[PDB]
C-alpha cells in the first residue's frame, strides 16, 4: 500500500516548508504594504495619493496691458 | 509681515505737465515722435520691475 498509493515522509516535510515559506512572505508583504499606504496618505510624498494641481503650462507670461501684472 | 517702504513726499516732487488733455492730444503725435527714448526707456522699467517705487527718476 505504502509503495503504490503514498510517498515518503519528505516529501510532505519540504512541501510544507515551502508552503509555509511561501505564506510567511505574504503575510510581511501585507504589513509593509498597509504601513507603505499609511505612509504616503499622511505625507504626500509617495507615487500614490497624488491628487491633482493646476498645471502650471496655463499661466501667460506676457505683458498685461499694465505694468504691475 | 514687514513694513511698506515708501518714498518720501520731497522725491515724488517733480515740475509738472500743466497742459490740459486738449493740448497733450493735439501734440501727442510729434510729441511720440520726439520724446521717444525717455519713455521707452521708463515703461521698460515699468513692466520689467513690476514696481512705481524703482522707476522714479
Ligand atoms: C491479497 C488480498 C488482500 C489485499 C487488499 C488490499 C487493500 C486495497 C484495496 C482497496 C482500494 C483502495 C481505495 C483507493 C484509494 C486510493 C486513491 C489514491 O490514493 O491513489 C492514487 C493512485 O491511483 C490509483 O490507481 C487508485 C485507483 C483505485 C480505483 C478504485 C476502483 C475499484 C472499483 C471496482 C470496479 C470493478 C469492475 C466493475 C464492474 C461493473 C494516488 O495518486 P498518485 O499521486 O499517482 O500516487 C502517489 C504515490 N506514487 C508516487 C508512488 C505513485
Known amino acids: ?69 | 509681515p514687514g513694513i511698506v517702504e515708501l518714498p518720501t513726499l520731497e522725491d515724488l516732487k517733480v515740475q509738472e505737465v500743466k497742459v490740459s488733455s486738449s493740448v497733450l492730444k493735439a501734440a501727442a503725435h510729434h510729441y511720440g515722435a520726439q520724446c521717444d527714448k525717455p519713455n521707452k526707456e521708463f515703461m521698460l522699467c515699468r513692466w520689467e520691475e513690476k514696481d512705481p517705487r524703482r522707476c522714479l527718476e
Do not use: C
Not at chain 1, 24 to 44: F, N, P, S, T
Open chain 1, 1 to 69: 500500500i505504502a509503495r503504490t498509493f503514498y510517498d515518503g515522509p519528505e516529501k510532505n516535510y519540504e512541501k510544507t516548508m515551502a508552503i509555509l515559506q511561501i505564506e510567511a512572505e505574504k503575510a510581511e508583504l501585507r504589513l509593509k504594504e498597509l504601513e507603505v499606504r499609511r505612509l504616503m496618505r499622511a505625507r504626500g510624498d509617495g507615487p500614490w495619493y497624488q491628487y491633482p494641481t493646476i498645471d502650471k503650462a496655463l499661466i501667460d507670461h506676457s505683458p498685461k496691458t499694465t505694468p504691475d501684472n
